[PDB]
Design a protein around this ligand. Structure first.
Ligand SMILES: CCCCCCCCCCCCCCCCCC(=O)OC[C@H](COP(=O)([O-])OCC(O)COP(=O)([O-])OC[C@@H](COC(=O)CCCCCCCCCCCCCCCCC)OC(=O)CCCCCCCCCCCCCCCCC)OC(=O)CCCCCCCCCCCCCCCCC
Ligand SMILES: CCCCCCCCCCCCCCCCCC(=O)OC[C@H](COP(=O)([O-])OCC(O)COP(=O)([O-])OC[C@@H](COC(=O)CCCCCCCCCCCCCCCCC)OC(=O)CCCCCCCCCCCCCCCCC)OC(=O)CCCCCCCCCCCCCCCCC
Ligand SMILES: CCCCCCCCCCCCCCCCCC(=O)OC[C@H](COP(=O)([O-])OCC(O)COP(=O)([O-])OC[C@@H](COC(=O)CCCCCCCCCCCCCCCCC)OC(=O)CCCCCCCCCCCCCCCCC)OC(=O)CCCCCCCCCCCCCCCCC
Ligand SMILES: CCCCCCCCCCCCCCCCC[C@@H](O)O[C@H](CO[C@H](O)CCCCCCCCCCCCCCC)COP(=O)(O)OCC[N+](C)(C)C
Ligand SMILES: CCCCCCCCCCCCCCCCC[C@@H](O)O[C@H](CO[C@H](O)CCCCCCCCCCCCCCC)COP(=O)(O)OCC[N+](C)(C)C
Ligand SMILES: CCCCCCCCCCCCCCCCC[C@@H](O)O[C@H](CO[C@H](O)CCCCCCCCCCCCCCC)COP(=O)(O)OCC[N+](C)(C)C
Ligand SMILES: CCCCCCCC/C=C\CCCCCCCC(=O)OC[C@H](COP(=O)(O)OCCN)OC(=O)CCCCCCC/C=C\CCCCCCCC
Ligand SMILES: CCCCCCCC/C=C\CCCCCCCC(=O)OC[C@H](COP(=O)(O)OCCN)OC(=O)CCCCCCC/C=C\CCCCCCCC
Ligand SMILES: CCCCCCCCCCCCCCCCCC(=O)OC[C@H](COP(=O)(O)OCCN)OC(=O)CCCCCCCCCCCCCCCCC
Lengths: 347, 140, 54, 69, 53, 99, 56, 121, 459
């Protein structure tokens, strides 16, 4: 792929997402979704191999089905109201269709399998862009249409996402599948808080995006896609492993790190609405995510795995490409708990 | 599902134990049917007869658990003359757990299910008494 | 020491929970990666959301 | 020791009074804010939870093809 | 979520098409132009909750 | 063998190189000064000075003040025939019972 | 020489200056809680001729 | 969304004109100092990742880190203070304009209030 | 409190900027200076607490714990410099940084005035401890020990977070002064039962309670010496401090909800002493003795009388000092023979006399020997339990007998008898080890001399 073509495809993905986030018309929002998917497929297929082709095929099928359901919901809403503006939807059936379509686009359970499948299939840069941006857009649509969300359906899908992400991440050994299940669990948390505070949804989105960017860029720096490949990083550049360890501790929600702020604020907000069982279950279930984060931390930094002999040549050579904003993402993902009241600025 | 739950709740707590058992059996059968549908979808059977056998096994297990829970809880509350008491729901939940253990042929599964289901059913009764809500309506 | 501390206090709280989590993790992650299977799952989920949720 | 390292009891007493006043006022404000949020979300008659409606400046009032609009 | 670039910049990208009582070619009226006009003028400026109530 | 692994090193004795070792550092001067700073600061400064500071901490708990107030109250109450310990902490006139 | 001693033993002032700065910040925090100074019913009194505040 | 759609809100405005009447954060704000600390930590981590001397190398780069963090932190603090002041303004306005919803209550003393006593024995 | 907090945050850069061979010296000297500075917190008032600012306050309960933490840091530095001779400079500095962060978090925890900030800090204490255990532990089981410790603590503490945010929503504040002054009775309801359960269970897991304590032998046995010292001396006291703080708003529900916990504490105190009688590992014996003592502290806090709280505070301070000293002695023995088996090394009285003296004094303090503050606290708790009921005396007497039995069993097994013939690498005791033992033991005797400093606010 030509660099000009790649940058124009990235620009087109961002253009689709921005069209979704600036449009006041359902047709224009659907157009933005379609443009985003159309420019996103080749990004997945950039490094051509059967795994990448299969991941792109599964992603295309899922997103096409979601777009069909979304346009059906738009049409049904138009039939009963004659309105194209994105507001509270006027038909419960259309609202259910839209909720299911946006949940499928996000990867909320039980629409999650494509997330680990595609994330394993595609490279690290593709997975980073996929997770971050393709969560960025449908959450914007949901925040706009939150006041008509069915709380029962939204919270059911959110709790399912949390449980399934925890269990899948428990089982996986592949780093990309681990990141995908982490994404599923975090999306569950965000959509669980969504029907109450879109501000808390946005706060969790920002913190999750920062932590995910830091983790993916650390993986790209170490060029490790498996647990054992990451187990050799301590013998080449031990600083990256320590930074990954503190980022993993933050992503598990351990105080006083940045990952505790979204969980804390969401639990507080849901408690304000007389919800106790759901916050307690969500808090207890995240211990699975913390467990497999800790298991990954044991293999990479807290213990020394055996290495090989060509690692001496690797010692002799130095990393060339410089990650952009990696130190900033590492600092923002661990040390911004004292800056919590800025969510009012986020309001 | 809402209609079945409404029927079960509308039947009074300590009376009409046969109707309570029937309603709980219907709820359990619906849950088992949903579980069997998801199981067939995700892990396809080797044959139509094997799929029907799996569906029947799961549905009967769930329905038996529900019937035992309803019978035990209603009869316990009736004989003890203490409605609105979580102990009856705990006894029903442990009875359902023992039924699940018998169905799966495992003493350990039966004991763990008795403990967990009894605690869960006691918590459900306490929530009904105290006004706890799982999917709380937005406010504030 | 043995019967209570090393056996039953371990069996009740920490070991049983870990076993349940491992079993559920295996159950969730044990997928053959078949779009036919999980799209049938999608159809079931859509039908359930349409009917059982009002 | 008292002269060199410590102050009188009046300082601690009155600082405690000031701290208590601040914290009590904060608690009152928090409860009142919760009440205000509940009322505003239930009624929609304040500046909060004003979900957008359709602007009436978009309506075209010019005469149409048909007299009856 | 919604960055109202149209309102900020004074642009009109889809508001012309949002409703059926807006400016139509050749002044062709909608089927329910009067009813939509009445509802919009009722619900203008009071928010979704009060508009529905 | 399954790896190219180092042999487990022999235990290192600090007394072999330095017979008069305090067990702090391999370097003799560093070890001696570590001993000196630990002993001086810890024992002398912390133990002695903090112990005498705590012993001569001013009576901010008002134990002696309470004893003197009790002496005055006992003297006054036994001089006037009043009970030494009052029956109630507060004033029943200032307390308003429900009907 | 003398330069090396300062080059090596300059870290021995960090904790003392931190203690000094902590005392200063404690004074700063105390001076913000002076809204009931000489206003409690227990310790209220008239100021001496040559003082402005009861405590600092 | 609580304060989204508030009347008179200009879209895409980080700081409106009505925020100018609030006290700006001091330059010695502890929050600003913490933002500068975050910038310094980012510079140290950058040196560590690029395998330069962590404390000595790249003084200009570390200074730029600290300065950028302080700049964005000052503006972020201004916006946060404006939003909290706006929240308090709206709350007080609603309380004042709904007296029947927020009525004053007669204050009784503990000599009149009867509280049950639970002995600890 | 900033005059104590800032010097720790300055210990950090001093550690990272000192030379390679001066880190231990500088850290020890300045830790001792900070401890001396923190000795000024003991001057407390008889009416109320020391309210420095809106964020931090000190009390007759917080002051001894803060002094104990600040005194414990340099001893941990001495032990760590003992066992980390061959480490690299960067990793030595990282270990010192972990210790400094732990001390800072503990100080802020003990002085935090709000329950939510207290929760944040007392949960932040987990990360340095977990890193220390799972990174500088000697054996394979350190990973499992860290997992058990972390998950026990977090599964206990998350419902506490939910309860704290709920209480803030209900009452308007989590400030301790406000919740103490504005406290209202807790009616007998399922919701109040479960709120009480959330708070008490979090702190009980921290204690630990009997039946929730396996993580304690796991972590204490497998942690390095400094980690073992901090885990027993201070980190076990966060649960007791929290219970003595939260129980303000949990009345009168504590009269009825405390029965299962009291029964568990008493019976498990007996059971853990009996377990100590039959331990083939010295560290495990010390850990189970810690469990028994903290069970007694739980009994005191649950019976919740002014005589019980003073005993609880005194016993917490005494247990911290004694358990730290016992762990240090066992670690010196381990550094000799590279094994934790109790019966491996014998005749250590004829091989090392002054260490035998230190063992004797530590064991005599471990059992309640008058007039030690250990006995003061235990006797106050026993008297309060006697006023509570008159069979608690039977249980306490059984526990005291078994405590003396296993303490003297450990002493006789390790020190008396004839030495192992084939162990010929037991070098004479170091000045550093002797100074560590002396600094462990002398403050305990001075506290015995002046006992009102550790009897808490109820004195
Ligand atoms: C909002 C709107 C949303 C949309 C709504 C739309 C509504 C209108 C629809 C209009 C009509 C559309 C027509 C076209 C649809 C698409 C057809 C298609 O492409 O099908 C391909 C698809 C597979 O294609 P293939 O690979 O060529 O076929 C492989 C062979 O079948 C060879 O396979 P095999 O040899 O491997 O085994 C044979 C068989 C073996 O089959 C089985 O094992 C299934 C056993 C089912 C038992 C059902 C029991 C029902 C009980 C009800 C309650 C009463 C009480 C019961 C008490 C207990 C009793 C025991 O199948 C399998 O093993 C495959 C696994 C999946 C089987 C079941 C598929 C249906 C969905 C899953 C749930 C099924 C019910 C589960 C139970 C719960 C019920 C609530 O075909 C099928 O799945 C079956 C044929 C098509 C039937 C379509 C019927 C309409 C569906 C709608
Ligand atoms: C200073 C206290 C900080 C407290 C925390 C604050 C937040 C974090 C600090 C910001 C980031 C700092 C830099 C990080 C990378 C450091 C790399 C390194 O080697 O550094 C050595 C470096 C000197 O060595 P070098 O010659 O440049 O290069 C040697 C090679 O780097 C030699 O490298 P190597 O090849 O030997 O690398 C191997 C090593 C590589 O290991 C590392 O690089 C460790 C550091 C990176 C890990 C992550 C750091 C934290 C990032 C944020 C996460 C949250 C932090 C808070 C967490 C709280 C809960 C735990 O890996 C291992 O040893 C693996 C085994 C250990 C793994 C398990 C333990 C992991 C612990 C993770 C948490 C650590 C928290 C504290 C970190 C303190 C770092 C100084 O010293 C420093 O960087 C010291 C810090 C800066 C001091 C500035 C002083 C300025 C002048 C005085 C100012 C006085 C106050 C001002 C006011 C006015 C007074 C008058
Ligand atoms: C199974 C046998 C059994 O029930 O043993 C209880 C027994 C408690 O001692 P107890 O002296 O028999 O109880 C006194 C009264 O019978 C019961 O006390 P009460 O009648 O005065 O009313 C107070 C009762 C109020 O009753 C309720 O609230 C009942 C409603 C259900 C509450 C569930 C709370 C669960 C809290 C987390 C537990 C994690 C384990 O409080 C509780 O139920 C406290 C629940 C927490 C107990 C301690 C949790 C740590 C256990 C450590 C070992 C785990 C293995 O043992 C256990 O709870 C643990 C071992 C059995 C499992
Ligand atoms: C491991 C998990 C903990 C293990 C169990 C801990 C001990 C639990 C013992 C049962 C509690 C019994 C008591 O607390 O509740 C009684 C009944 O308990 C419940 O009905 C059962 C809850 C589930 C119990 C599970 C443990 C299994 C114990 C089985 C027998 C327990 C009941 C024994 C006969 C009463 C009724 O007491 P009551 O005076 O009304 O107070 C109720 C509060 N009110 C007044 C507001 C209503
Ligand atoms: C017969 C057998 C008797 C054998 C006794 C052996 C001891 C010799 C006799 C006792 C010493 C003579 C009496 C000294 C006594 O008076 O001083 C004590 C005081 O001792 C010290 O206070 C003990 C200090 C304990 C604190 C040490 C801190 C050092 C750092 C340790 C940090 C770790 C501590 C962690 C928990 C805080 C008691 O206080 P007090 O009787 O009124 O002093 C009178 C002076 N007044 C009138 C002005 C008050
Ligand atoms: C007239 C000539 C002078 C004009 C001056 C320019 C006027 C302002 C121009 C603003 C830039 C031009 C537009 C560029 C995009 C605008 C982005 C921003 O300005 O908009 C604001 C948005 O500001 C950002 O949201 C605040 C950024 C806060 C970043 C931190 C988040 C808090 C994290 C908590 C932890 C903090 C850790 C420390 C961080 C370093 C509000 O816009 P709004 O239309 O209403 O948003 C709608 C969506 N809502 C309602 C749901 C919010
Ligand atoms: C709240 C705490 C409640 C405390 C109840 C604890 C449960 C007591 C039963 C423990 C003894 C059962 C047993 O031995 O195993 C049962 C069995 C065998 O596994 P093991 O290999 O023996 O586990 C050891 C793993 N190393 O494991 C199980 O737990 C069975 C699975 C449980 C059935 C599913 C639970 C159903 C509950 C539904 C609502 C939730
Ligand atoms: C499987 C069975 C598990 C049994 C253990 C329970 C843990 C599962 C947590 C799920 C919640 C179950 C209890 C729910 C209690 C609850 O929500 O109500 C408490 C009450 C609700 O009041 P309202 O909603 O306002 O009602 C208004 C009335 N007009 O709110 C509170 O007080 C906050 C309480 C926080 C929830 C506590 C849930 C856990 C109970 C404590 C157990 C602690 C376990 C600690 C683990 C360590 C050992 C394993
Ligand atoms: C060189 C290496 C890179 C690190 C540079 C660190 C300093 C950067 C700032 C330089 C000074 C800029 C300045 O003018 O600051 C003044 C300003 C407060 O001024 P003002 O409030 O107006 O005056 C008092 C009025 N009452 O001050 C502020 O507003 C404070 C904002 C900065 C907060 C900094 C926090 C710490 C940053 C790291 C310090 C590291 C020190 C050691 C470096 C060693 C290098 C080898």
């Amino acid at each position: 792929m030509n660099p000009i073509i790649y940058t124009t495809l990235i620009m087109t993905v961002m253009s689709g997402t921005m069209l979704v986030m600036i449009s006041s018309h359902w047709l224009l929002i659907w157009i933005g979704f379609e443009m985003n998917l159309l420019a996103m497929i080749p990004v997945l297929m950039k490094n051509f191999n059967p795994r990448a082709t299969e991941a792109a095929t599964k992603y295309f099928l899922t997103q096409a089905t979601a777009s069909m359901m979304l346009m059906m919901a738009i049409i049904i809403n138009l039939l009963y109201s004659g309105q194209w503006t994105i507001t509270k939807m006027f038909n419960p059936v259309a609202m259910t269709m839209m909720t299911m379509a946006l949940a499928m686009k996000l990867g909320l359970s039980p629409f999650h399998f494509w997330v680990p499948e595609v994330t394993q299939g595609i490279s690290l840069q593709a997975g980073l862009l996929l997770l971050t941006w393709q969560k960025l857009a449908p959450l914007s649509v949901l925040c706009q249409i939150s006041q008509s969300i069915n709380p029962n359906l939204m919270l059911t899908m959110a709790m399912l996402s949390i449980l399934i992400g925890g269990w899948g991440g428990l089982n996986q050994t592949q780093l990309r599948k681990i990141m995908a299940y982490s994404s599923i669990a975090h999306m569950g948390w965000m959509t669980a808080v969504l029907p109450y505070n879109t501000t808390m949804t946005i706060l969790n989105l920002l913190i999750y995006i920062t932590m995910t960017l830091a983790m993916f860029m650390l993986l790209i720096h170490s060029s490790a896609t498996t647990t054992l490949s990451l187990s050799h990083t301590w013998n080449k550049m031990p600083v990256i492993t320590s930074l990954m360890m503190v980022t993993l501790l933050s992503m598990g929600g351990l105080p006083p790190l940045s990952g505790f702020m979204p969980k804390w604020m969401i639990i507080q907000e849901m408690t304000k609405n007389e919800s106790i069982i759901m916050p307690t279950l969500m808090a207890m279930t995240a211990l699975l995510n913390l467990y497999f984060y800790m298991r990954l931390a044991y293999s990479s930094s807290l213990t020394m795995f055996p290495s090989t002999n060509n690692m001496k040549m690797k010692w002799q050579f130095e990393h060339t490409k410089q990650m952009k904003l990696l130190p900033t993402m590492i600092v923002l993902s661990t040390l911004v708990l004292p800056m919590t009241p800025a969510l009012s600025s986020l309001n | 599902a809402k209609t079945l739950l409404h029927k079960y709740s509308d039947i009074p707590e300590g009376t009409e134990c046969h109707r309570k058992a029937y309603a709980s059996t219907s709820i359990g059968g619906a849950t088992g049917l949903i579980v069997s549908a998801y199981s067939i979808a995700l892990k396809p059977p080797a044959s139509f007869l094997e799929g029907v056998a799996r569906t029947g096994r799961y549905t009967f297990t769930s329905a038996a658990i529900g019937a035992i829970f309803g019978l035990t809880s209603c009869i316990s509350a009736q004989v003890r003359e203490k409605p609105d008491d979580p102990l009856n729901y705990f006894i029903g939940g442990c009875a359902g757990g023992l039924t699940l253990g018998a169905r799966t042929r495992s003493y350990g599964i039966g004991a763990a299910a008795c403990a967990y289901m009894g605690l869960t059913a006691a918590l459900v009764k306490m929530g009904q008494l105290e006004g706890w809500q799982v999917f709380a309506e937005p406010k504030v | 020491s043995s019967l209570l501390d090393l056996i039953w206090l371990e069996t009740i709280l920490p070991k049983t929970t870990s076993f349940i989590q491992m079993k559920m993790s295996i159950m969730v992650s044990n997928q053959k990666g078949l779009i036919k299977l999980y799209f049938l799952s999608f159809l079931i989920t859509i039908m359930i959301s349409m009917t059982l949720f009002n | 020791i008292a002269r060199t390292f410590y102050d009188g009891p009046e300082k601690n007493y009155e600082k405690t009074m000031a701290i208590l006043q601040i914290e009590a006022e904060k608690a009152e404000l928090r409860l009142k804010e919760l009440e205000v949020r509940r009322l505003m979300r239930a009624r929609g008659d304040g500046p909060w939870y004003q979900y957008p409606t359709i602007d009436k400046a978009l309506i075209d009032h010019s005469p149409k093809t048909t007299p009856d609009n | 979520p919604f960055f109202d670039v149209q309102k900020r910049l004074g642009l009109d990208l889809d508001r012309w098409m949002t409703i059926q009582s807006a400016e139509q070619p050749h002044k062709i009226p909608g089927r329910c132009h009067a009813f939509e006009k009445e509802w919009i003028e009722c619900a203008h400026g009071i928010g979704g909750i009060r508009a529905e109530k | 063998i399954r790896l190219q692994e180092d042999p487990d090193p022999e235990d290192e004795n600090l007394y072999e190189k330095n017979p008069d070792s305090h067990g702090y550092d391999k370097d003799p001067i560093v070890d001696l000064w570590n001993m000196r700073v630990v002993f001086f600061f810890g024992f002398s400064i912390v133990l002695v000075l903090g112990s005498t500071f705590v012993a001569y901490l001013p009576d901010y708990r008002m134990q002696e003040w309470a004893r003197r107030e009790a002496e005055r109250l006992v003297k006054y109450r036994e001089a006037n025939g009043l009970p030494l310990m009052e029956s109630n902490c507060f004033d029943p006139n200032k307390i308003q019972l429900p009907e | 020489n003398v330069l090396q001693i300062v080059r090596d033993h300059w870290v021995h002032i960090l904790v003392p200056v931190g203690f000094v700065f902590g005392c200063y910040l404690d004074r700063r925090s105390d001076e913000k809680l002076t809204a009931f100074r000489n206003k409690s019913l227990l310790f209220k009194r008239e100021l001496r001729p040559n003082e402005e505040v009861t405590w600092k | 969304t609580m304060m989204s759609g508030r009347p008179g809100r200009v879209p895409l405005q980080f700081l409106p004109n009505e925020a100018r009447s609030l006290p700006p954060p001091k330059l010695t704000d502890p929050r600003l100092v913490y933002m500068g600390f975050l910038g310094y930590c980012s510079g140290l981590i950058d040196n560590a990742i690029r395998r330069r001397p962590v404390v000595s190398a790249g003084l200009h780069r570390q200074l730029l880190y600290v300065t950028s963090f302080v700049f964005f932190g000052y503006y972020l603090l201004k916006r946060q203070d404006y939003m909290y002041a706006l929240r308090d303004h709206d709350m007080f306005a609603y309380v004042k304009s709904h007296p029947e919803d927020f009525p004053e209550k007669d204050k009784k003393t503990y000599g009149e209030i009867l509280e049950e006593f639970h002995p600890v024995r | 409190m900033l005059k104590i907090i800032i010097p720790t945050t300055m210990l950090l850069p001093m550690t990272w900027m000192s030379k390679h061979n001066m880190i231990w010296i500088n850290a020890t000297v300045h830790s001792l200076l900070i401890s001396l500075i923190s000795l000024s917190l003991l001057n407390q008032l008889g009416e109320n607490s020391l309210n420095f600012s809106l964020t931090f306050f000190s009390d007759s309960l917080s002051a001894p714990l803060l002094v104990l933490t600040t005194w414990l840091l340099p001893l941990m530095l001495m032990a760590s410099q003992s066992h980390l001779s061959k480490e690299t400079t960067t990793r030595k500095k990282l270990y010192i940084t972990m210790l400094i962060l732990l001390q800072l978090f503990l100080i802020m925890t003990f002085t935090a005035t709000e329950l939510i900030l207290f929760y944040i800090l007392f949960e932040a204490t987990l990360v340095p401890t977990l890193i220390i255990i799972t990174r500088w532990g000697n054996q394979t089981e350190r990973l499992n020990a860290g997992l058990y410790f972390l998950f026990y603590t977090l599964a206990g503490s998350l419902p506490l977070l939910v309860a704290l945010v709920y209480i803030q929503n209900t009452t308007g504040s989590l400030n301790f002064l406000i919740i103490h002054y504005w406290s209202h009775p807790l009616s007998n309801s399922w919701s109040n039962i479960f709120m009480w359960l959330a708070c008490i269970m979090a702190f009980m897991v921290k204690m630990p309670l009997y039946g929730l304590h396996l993580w304690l032998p796991k972590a204490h046995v497998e942690a390095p010496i400094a980690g073992s010292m901090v885990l027993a001396a201070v980190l076990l006291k966060l649960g007791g401090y929290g219970m003595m703080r939260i129980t303000t708003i949990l009345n009168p529900l504590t009269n009825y909800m405390a029965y299962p916990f009291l029964m568990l504490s008493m019976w498990g105190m007996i059971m853990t002493s009996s377990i100590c009688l039959r331990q083939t590992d010295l560290k495990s014996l010390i850990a189970y003795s810690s469990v028994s003592h903290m069970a007694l502290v739980i009994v005191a806090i649950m019976i919740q009388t002014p005589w019980s709280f003073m005993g609880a505070t005194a016993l917490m301070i005494a247990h911290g000092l004694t358990s730290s000293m016992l762990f240090c002695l066992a670690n010196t023995n381990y550094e000799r023979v590279h094994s934790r088996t109790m019966i491996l090394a014998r005749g250590l009285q004829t091989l090392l006399p002054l260490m035998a003296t230190w063992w004797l004094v530590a064991s005599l303090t471990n059992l309640a020997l008058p007039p030690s503050i250990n006995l003061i606290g235990e006797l106050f708790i026993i008297t309060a339990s006697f006023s509570w009921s008159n069979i608690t005396i039977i249980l306490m007497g059984m526990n005291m007998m078994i405590t003396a039995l296993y303490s003297l069993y450990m002493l006789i097994t390790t020190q008396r008898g004839k030495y192992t013939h084939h162990i010929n690498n037991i070098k004479p005791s170091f000045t550093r080890e002797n100074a560590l033992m002396a600094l462990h033991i002398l403050p305990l005797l001075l506290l015995t001399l002046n006992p009102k400093m550790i009897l808490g606010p109820l004195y």
